[PDB]
């Protein structure tokens, strides 16, 4: 029967039929994972012969399955029951996991008992444990995966200055100027869990040290020196779980034989484990819940913050058009260009807004400007007006687009007539105490042509001959008062009750001897 | 013994409102009730015998309901995770086939339960109230409550829009009773399943969908045409249509035996395992993957939309305002030492544009930004803005460049010609325009302003005054300040005719020179 089985050949996956499609194929009709190495002198090595059929003949809850071997000249690779999950070093690092301590004490222990049986058998503890190949099931079952099939493996010095990329949790005493063997020392495998338990107790890579960080090169050769200290990446000085680090401790001083059998390591894990150690079977259940959960959460958090960026991605390319296009992107493709003639506009500015401002001092009225920008903004809401323009020389704003009524924005421009007025004795300059700055403003009614430009950030643009001809007849403004001109006064006549004066007839460049009037209230 | 004390003395005093509230234990879930008057009987004595008596694996537990004279309440555990019907409804969340399959086979096994024994009935087996346990253990509500229900006659909303569920058996009455009929509990499942079986919300097939009032009286007024919502025409569920089809049963019999139900349910069950936790495993396992899923898709959208957003906020502003975003929070306004502002305009603009049509004008001034964009490729020029015809721009950068402002004329006299040449208005092939430039060279401050939109604004007394004088300028010649006349003294390789001393308002006789090229 051994040498039926043995002469059986039940190992051999050939690499005919699998399809490809860190990098998964599949196989036997299931998810699988392959991992070759450069190598083209196989042979029908007995030895590995006899550790090959015995793996595969080598079972438990968590150890990781195998399936079949690469035995073709374009490769040879072993054949994995792939997982779900990354590597754990990934699964704590990505901190997007919220782990819980009962989780991290239930990880370590199912790490404990899985490399207990990988020791108790006639396979021996692996050579290499590192904590970036214990693989997470599907169910959530720890599995070491990787280990075993001694002659089937890219054991060589080839890459000599690069092997230091990744020897961190070598053994001490194996990762010496010497040619190590395969198997590994079961010392290593105390020291390669004290790492390990190290990583998933800090929750930051290997060899996490705050006060001083080195490359691999730094802590291979610190690690190498055996220095008097007993050099290890430090533990958090609480005395919450002193315990595991006192373990740990015991794993990793460089006395061969004090790191001791996991014998007494089960011990000392089920006596710490006694606050929640509770049973086998429901393990599952509550562990999954709890990661659910949190996933769950996590996922609400990222939703909820979407959103946020809608709400400022909509800010930025709708609000620039007058509130009338806040309908015309929100379903209003009926928002297209006017022909309204009864509209009313206000441009204004500061006397002496800008030669004082700019030349008191530098960088000391910004500020100010702002302010008035945000307070003049807010009161610009208490009316309905879509804001044109906020020149330089002025800002001007003309109704009428929120709602097509002819009778709106000739009352809406005069209400603004005396908040603008209300406004020269608003927005004190608080840097100035002794400081004033008064405001010119007019009125000019007449046909009017509002439109959409722009590709990028399109922006509404409401041109007219009456709009120039109002710039360059107001471009006389007096401080502290309102202009206002035949159109906007027969606006004035039918927009309401209101008390408008006589000034009498003003000489316009362009436009001549024009009778003009002042707003009162 | 029991009769001695209720053991059901809810009084909030325990709890801690903090509509679940907590109470020494997880969540307790309450629900209030209009009774507001009390008189409890040996009736209510059983009641309450009977609330305590199961304590069956898919029922849900209460404790003890409040009844104090001005509110009563029943203090149940708040399985939390939303609702059967809503963890369908939600898209996001995507049940397999054998996932809502299996969920249907533990409502059987939970209803099986629920009256074979002690209790007789409950009547209300909303799917809205059969919510999921914190770990994929379905219940059902409210069973028993001998009177714990709005029994107050509306005879109104309250019929329009909570009386749906129960089914014509019941619906073809006027004295609603505290349990509802046995074959009331088979239609309770009907429609139950009505509502697994496809995602749609409640008691609606495709096509006509009358609004829930027509709901409810065709389900009082039902014809021959047996109206149940028949399921969906894929035939790999065909069978439960078979049961569906047969459980709203006209003949109040035929509605079949409720373990039959079960049993058939068996024969049909997928042949998965008979493990009581693998299932509950395999579940939470699909729907941990499903979370995965849409964690992946929002992070995706969201990078997206923000990189989308990014972009545009770099076009608004000037390339210092990308760097600005880049990390910089804080910006205060740059006093520079010495920039120059081109001022540009046609001659005319304002009466050609008025004297053409507005609609066609839309088409003119798309023609009029076109033709601007070859000019915004000259050199490093940021456009402050584009009110009306003036089309104007500063060369000032973030950082020191080596007196390229004077650059900044230079572009401009590059890109005038080159622009009026060939650019036509599409809708006035017949008339043509000039473009005049109006150039100065001088200091300014410029920041951003405002922050929710913010905009860079530069202020100097040489930008006003120069766009004020450029404002009235030579015919087809770019005009330049002597001011950034002598500038274009020191940076060589052009030529400058110089206009001579032209009277600027508020600056008297100024020079100015004519750009030569
Ligand atoms: N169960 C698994 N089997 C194979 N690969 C996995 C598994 N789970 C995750 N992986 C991914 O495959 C890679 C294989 O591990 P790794 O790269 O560490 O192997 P290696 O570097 O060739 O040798 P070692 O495992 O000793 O480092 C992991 O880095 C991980 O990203
Ligand atoms: N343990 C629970 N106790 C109470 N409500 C819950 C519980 N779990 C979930 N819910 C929520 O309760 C809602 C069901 O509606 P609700 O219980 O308010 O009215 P009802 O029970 O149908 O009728 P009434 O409340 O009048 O008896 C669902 O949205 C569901 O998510």
Redesign the pocket.
């Known amino acids: 029967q051994l040498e039926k089985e043995l002469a059986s050949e039940l190992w051999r996956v050939r690499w005919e039929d699998v399809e490809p499609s ?2 998964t194929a599949y196989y036997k009709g299931n998810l699988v ?3 070759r ?1 450069n190598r083209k002198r196989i042979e029908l090595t007995r030895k590995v012969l006899f550790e090959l059929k015995h793996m595969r003949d080598v079972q438990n809850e968590h150890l ?1 399955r195998f399936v079949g071997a690469c035995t073709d000249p374009p490769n040879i690779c072993i054949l ?4 779900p ?3 754990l070093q ?1 699964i704590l690092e990505n901190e997007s996991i919220t782990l819980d301590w009962m989780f991290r004490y239930s990880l370590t222990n199912d790490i404990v008992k899985g490399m207990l049986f990988l020791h108790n058998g006639a396979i021996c503890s692996h050579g ?1 444990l ?1 904590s ?2 214990c ?2 099931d599907g169910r959530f079952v720890l ?1 070491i ?2 280990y075993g099939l001694e002659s089937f ?2 054991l060589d010095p080839e890459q000599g200055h690069t092997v230091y990329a ?1 020897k961190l949790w070598t053994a001490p005493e194996l990762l010496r100027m010497a040619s190590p063997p395969v198997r590994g020392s079961q010392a290593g495998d105390v020291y390669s869990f004290g790492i390990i338990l190290q990583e998933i107790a800090l929750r930051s890579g290997v060899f996490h040290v705050e006060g001083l960080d080195l490359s691999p090169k730094e802590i291979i050769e610190r690690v190498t020196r055996g220095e008097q200290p007993p050099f290890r990446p430090s533990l958090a000085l609480q005395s919450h779980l002193e315990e595991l680090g006192l373990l740990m401790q015991r794993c990793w001083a460089e006395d061969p034989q004090e790191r001791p059998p996991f014998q007494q390591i089960r011990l000392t894990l089920r006596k710490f484990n006694r606050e929640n150690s509770s049973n086998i079977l429901d393990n599952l259940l509550s562990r999954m819940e709890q990661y659910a959960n949190n996933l769950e959460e996590l996922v609400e958090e990222r939703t909820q913050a979407y959103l946020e960026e809608k709400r400022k991605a909509e800010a930025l390319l709708y609000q620039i058009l007058p509130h009338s296009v806040a309908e015309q992107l929100k379903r209003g493709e009926t928002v297209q260009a006017e022909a309204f003639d009864s509209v009313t506009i206000y441009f204004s500015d500061i006397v002496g807004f800008t030669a004082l401002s700019a030349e008191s001092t530098p960088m000391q009225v910004v500020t100010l400007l702002n302010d008035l920008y945000t307070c003049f903004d807010a009161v610009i809401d208490n009316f309905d007006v879509y804001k044109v323009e906020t020149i330089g020389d002025a800002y001007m704003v003309v109704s009428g687009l929120p709602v097509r009524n002819g009778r709106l924005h000739a009352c809406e421009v005069a209400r603004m007539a005396l908040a603008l007025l209300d406004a020269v004795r608003s927005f004190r300059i608080r840097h100035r105490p002794q400081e004033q700055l008064r405001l010119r403003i007019g009125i000019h009614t007449g046909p009017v042509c509002a439109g959409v430009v722009g590709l990028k950030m399109p922006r509404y643009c409401l041109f007219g001959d009456t709009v120039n001809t109002a710039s360059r007849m107001e471009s006389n403004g007096e401080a502290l008062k309102i202009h206002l001109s035949s159109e906007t006064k027969a606006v004035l006549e039918e927009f309401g009750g209101f008390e408008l004066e006589l000034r009498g007839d003003v000489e316009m460049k362009g436009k001549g001897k024009v009778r003009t009037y002042w707003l009162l209230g």
């Open positions: 860190a990098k994972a392959v991992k190495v990781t994995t029951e792939y997982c999950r990354g590597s990934d290499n590192k970036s190949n693989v997470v599995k995966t990787d493996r890219d990744k």
